[model samples]
Target: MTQKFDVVVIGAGPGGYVAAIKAAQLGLKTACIEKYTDAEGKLALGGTCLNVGCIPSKALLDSSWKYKEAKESFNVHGISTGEVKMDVAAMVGRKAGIVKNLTGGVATLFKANGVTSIQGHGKLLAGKKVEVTKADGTTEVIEAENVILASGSRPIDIPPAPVDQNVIVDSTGALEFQAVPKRLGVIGAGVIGLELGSVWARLGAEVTVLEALDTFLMAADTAVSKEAQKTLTKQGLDIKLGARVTGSKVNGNEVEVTYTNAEGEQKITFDKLIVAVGRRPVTTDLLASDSGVTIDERGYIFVDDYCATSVPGVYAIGDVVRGMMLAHKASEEGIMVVERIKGHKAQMNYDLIPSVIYTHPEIAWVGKTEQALKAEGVEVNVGTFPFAASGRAMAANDTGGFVKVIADAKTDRVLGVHVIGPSAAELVQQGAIAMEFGTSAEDLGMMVFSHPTLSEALHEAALAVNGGAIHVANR
Candidate 1:
């Protein structure tokens, strides 16, 4: 019998680990069990984010984009350094260094906060108990007053294009490619697909993306999606919409993918294929039969607004529960859960949780999109400002998108902010902060933003909401 703790959190992902640390720091004993129990299962601090998903992908995107900029965009300023080359080893190895340091940093945080990082695959039992399967084939049961489930998610594999980790690869395998393929075939044009596709396309790979949906980036505002599609297309990415992949065949180092589109069935061969359709929650073997935690038909754990499971004192957060499967969202939910456990009324604005895609120029948004509002019959005033008008953007020579601000026509309350331009992620975050405080479009426009910055595009957008923009003609 192991010593009982105040809280036992299963899975040391962003959500589970942050919940454990916050609970411990709040003067409660906490133990976090992660799947690092395997003899060779050494991983790092952040869950999927730091390890394989967000961090690694972003690192590759950054390095690839820099390589591309140097190779293609270093001219027109009279500065010519000929023959910019990319060292593939350095590009890939940089992420490994970042991974270890950050993972170890989290490990150090556990030591500092007195939170036990239990090495095990943990499952929830009835009555808020956790049964942990430790390495070396051993089992231990830890009792706790509360259990937080943050099992996270894995990339969903499709049978049509099975990942061999060589010719055909999933998202994780895509990250470890030694060299850029001559021909890259990417299945799905979602965020993951576009991001991975952009990485290779910018790296000089002949890339073709097959998307079943007719719309590109269906979740983003249609205008932003159009701009993203146009920009990526101009960047040498062949985005095939309404193309549903039927099957694939791998011969030697080449993969032939067959798909059907409105034009009829088609086939294409690629040196490397990436399957990035989407991801699914990690819930298998995570909860016992009577753990009192409920999951729907889709394998998503059931939770209320506060991430509480059906059982008392048991909670679920992050991708395991309902909501977007984002790392930062999971982290905030982790903090909120532990705070509530410590008798604090902590809640999250589920709507204002920002979503972003890390391709060139970036794409990000917060709150309800313009299309979503229209579908809900919400009369809204939409203001848009193109980056082409910004002196800062013109100086950078990366003016390829715009900022759209949506506000309620009646109340003037900011409803959403969408961007597809440089530094879109941070600009969207600023919108999220303003929307969080229920700031109106007029009030946001009244605030002075520094001159000649990407953020000024956001300011121009808020002013454009009521046709008061200075730099652009009022509509």
Candidate 2:
């Protein structure tokens, strides 16, 4: 059987589902395709992010952070509320409930927007045709005037170290572990690796992170990354920088991860091995060769400013595109792509996008980093304000990290803002907004931030960039 619509969105993820809803809002007959199904029917409305990625991960990360705080840091600040123990199953169940409720909310939104939700794995038949295969083995073709690919990315599988889900696990699988391992080895020190690794570390696992790269979080500001490494280590996480995991083997009850370091071969045994090297766009099996979509060598679809792919009526966005794979970034792309298709003059400033990690002392940043400025040969003034000087940080007992501001030396335009402290992810929006408006460091500094709040640290950081900070030692 076959159905037709004005717009067909594949994958129903953060990008796909949002784009479909927006298209429907613009009065385009839209249909979204997804694979999973539950008692409520097909999971066609919310895609992978609400279903498995962002929402769920953040929920778990928040719970884990609370658990860690109550267990370790609470007593140090004279707020000893007795011994805090983790109920693993309870935490997992809470995360599941949140995910289900949020996914259901998306379904309601889709209904409100008049978007059709299709159940099945959607595969591209050609430029404007999609074949959906249901769980019951039924197949249907969906033809549309326009096609959008939002099939999000998945954790990359490293051959020879196949994920067993029991011993070797991916980021998703690690979240569902029954108990915290006595010894945990995390591969890759990127966002996913660090975030998930921090969770288990907080839950009482001895975590050792192995990264092939010389430093953790190369995408972040160097000072912030260095401080993060120091803080994470202070929280009992062992880091093995510039270490390449050669392979892993499961013994009687332990997994031995073999790695090659600068000093040569080294073997480490752990209760579990987490592989978080990176994620790749899940477009290969779905995007047909004749689809006319130009996928890069890494399998990401090439798209224009409007998120339109090489095929005139076809578009791709989100992690499947060649940009930062944050869910919000994908959401922005999805919104802009739909608006553009509706003949609205909408565009996304890729530079203004924010990236955040929900780790313990959460990391968030926006705009160009020092490395980026140096690479581009752009000179800029840098300033920093430590959380140690903030009354809010003292009250929260998390005065470890700092906020950094970078600005064009000549123009005084805010170039970037990086933060590593409590609620850093939440604080980064200020930077995003400031950079979007091309605001100067002095402009941010001049703004009155509420007393003793984290925003004051930002104000001070801005001041340090433009002139000198008052609360903290100027640098």
Candidate 3:
């Protein structure tokens, strides 16, 4: 007998599970398929974000930051904590517990929302059908009126550095280290690389990040990138830009990495190496030959602006489709896709999407960079306020970067906002909300902010856009 659903979502990651929940909430018979299993062989929901990517990484980052703060900053606060140390196993265990709770919560949500949870690999078939292969080799066909592909993505491995799951590892393996490596080498200084490097570096590891590109954090605003590089270097992250990895040699307990840069070829030995170059969409054996869904050259499923694929009744979102490979981005896309399916005419504002780097003095931004606006020939009025001037940041003793606001010279409309300082991830949300409502720079400047808070940096930056800042001398 063929089971049927009004909507079937392939992959129970943030995107797929959210889509399934929303579809079921809208009175559709929805089912979500997931193949991920925990070490105990039980079906795991929440996918990589819960298992290893965002949640676990952030947990470790938080733990590591607390350790760093205790060892370095507590003395200034008159809190004499002697010899701050980290128990790597305990930290890893704590992260695991958090993941387990969240994944289990997702299972409960599925039940609450009346979403059918299928523990299997879902392969898209022709005519809106899905071929599900269970762990025990049982197969079943699911006929669906609509199919949403949220297969997600996996880490990209380079020829120079192959993860051995031990001394050499990818981002997932990097998380499970029983003890912090004395020397940690990371390839690619993107978000994952920087974050992982920052975690161990704070825990007393000498971290070296080798980026192939000459520019550090090229995807971020130039000012933010420069500030980040400076701050991370000060915190003991030896970022070597333009150092392209050529090969790796694994010894019994260590690995030697060879790379080339402007200074020519060089080699460095490390206790462990992490390959965080990038990630690609996971589409292997996912689609039937006649499924009518087309994958592009880069493995991303081809979809319209609203996530609808070429074939009718088939859609793809999150890492499997276009746009940033962010968990929240994926979740929102899932909601949008399901809302569209429910005939709600919902659409995502691609421009208002925000990006954040979870490093010490976290970096975050939304909308155009000054360089990007210049390239687009848009004349922009720029404003900047350093965290050094923030009473809140000074009180916290973590002042490091600044907040920047960019507005159109002609219209005074806020084009972008970038922040690299304490609570930057939370502060950037104000910009996102303002931008979403088309709030202008003057509008933001007129708004009163709470006293002695980091948010005042945004207000000052907005005021500085017209050289009318109150707190500091506007340039």
Candidate 4:
């Protein structure tokens, strides 16, 4: 049967579903297609974000953090506790249940918004046409006036260490570990590698992260990156920089990894190996030759500033396009594209978007780093305030890292805000908001912050930009 819709969205991830719901609400007949299935063979609607990427990973991170705190931090509070143990099966089950609820919630939202949900593999065809292959091998062609591609992405696997979903596993397989391995080896020190390694490292696994880059967290501010490396290393994560893996061999239930470092070649054996180098856009079996949707050499769909593809009435967004692959970024892009379709010239502020790492003493930043500014020959004033001076941090016994604010030397306009401390993820949002309104650093410093609050660190940092900080000696 040939089905028709005013708008057809392929791949119901965070970006795809949001676009579908918004288009339907805007008086367009919308249909969303997804081909994801859970372990028990059930339709899953939320794609990687809910099923295995963001939500489930955060759930495990939270659970593991609690367990670590109970075992290590109880005596510091003058409290007594019995042995702290973790049930691996229970933890995994809890994560699975949470994923179920959220994916199911997406389904409910689709129904409420009058967006038709289809379970099938969607492929782009000529003239804004879509072909869906159902589970029973039946085919259906969908005619649409507009099409949005949001196929999201998967974890990248290296040729040297192919994933067997057993000893050598990818990010998705790392999530489904039945039990924590005694020795865990992560191939990359990127976001996913560090996060997953931290989860098992907290559970008593001897984690060794091997990174090809000599520097740790090169994307973060140099000071913040150095501080993060120190903090994570103190927590027992053995991070090795400049170590590039060349090959891996799986023997029985263990895997031996071969890598080259500055000191030459070395081998390490691990019970489980995680390959989390990075991710690439997913475009397999997606676009037909006659679809008129152009893709670059790197396999990303070519889109304009407003996300309009080569052909009119066709667009692409999310991980499949350029930019950071954060879920919120994708959602905002989805909303912007739909708004443009409704004749509203909406656009996103790519510069003001915040990036966060959800580890203990979370690392987050928005706008340019100090090094990036220096490279561009930008004249700037930098200010910083450590959490050690914050009364709230002292009360919580989580004093670590600092907040830094960068501003124009002449105009005092806020250029960037970077933080690696308690509630850094929440704190950086304030910087994002201020930058959106073109608030100056002097303006931020003059504002009154609540006494003894963590936010005072931000206020103090802004003040330090002009050498007028009250909390600490101006640097």
The best candidate by lDDT is 3
Cα lDDT of model 4 by residue, 153-188, tens digit? 988878999999999988898888989999999999
Q: How good is model 1 by TM-score? A: 0.97
lDDT of 1 by residue, 1-475 (tens): 5669998888887898788889989999999888752123664457888788888899999999988888778886666886887777788889878877788888888899999888878888887778888767799888999888999999888989998899999998888888889999999999999899999898889999999988888889989888889989999899999999999999999999999999899999999999988899998789888887888889998889999888889889998888988988898989998999889999988889999999887999998888999999999999999999999999998888899999999999999999999999999999999998999999999999999899999999999999999999997
lDDT of model 3, residue 367: 94
lDDT of each: 0.89, 0.85, 0.93, 0.91
Mind giving the per-residue lDDT tens digits that candidate 3 earns over 290-318?
Answer: 99999898999999889999999999999
Off by over 4 Å in 4: none
Minimum summed lDDT over a 10-residue window in model 3 is located at 39-48
Model 1 local distance difference test score: 0.89
Comparing candidate 1 with candidate 3, which one achieves the higher lDDT? Answer: 3
lDDT of 2 by residue, 229-316 (tens): 9988987789899899988889966898889999999999999888999998887568767877787888888887788888888888
Specify the highest-TM-score model's number.
Answer: 3
Model 4: ten consecutive residues of lowest lDDT: 38-47
Clashes in each model (backbone N, CA, C under 3 Å)? 1, 1, 0, 0
What does the lDDT read for residue 127 in candidate 2?
Answer: 54
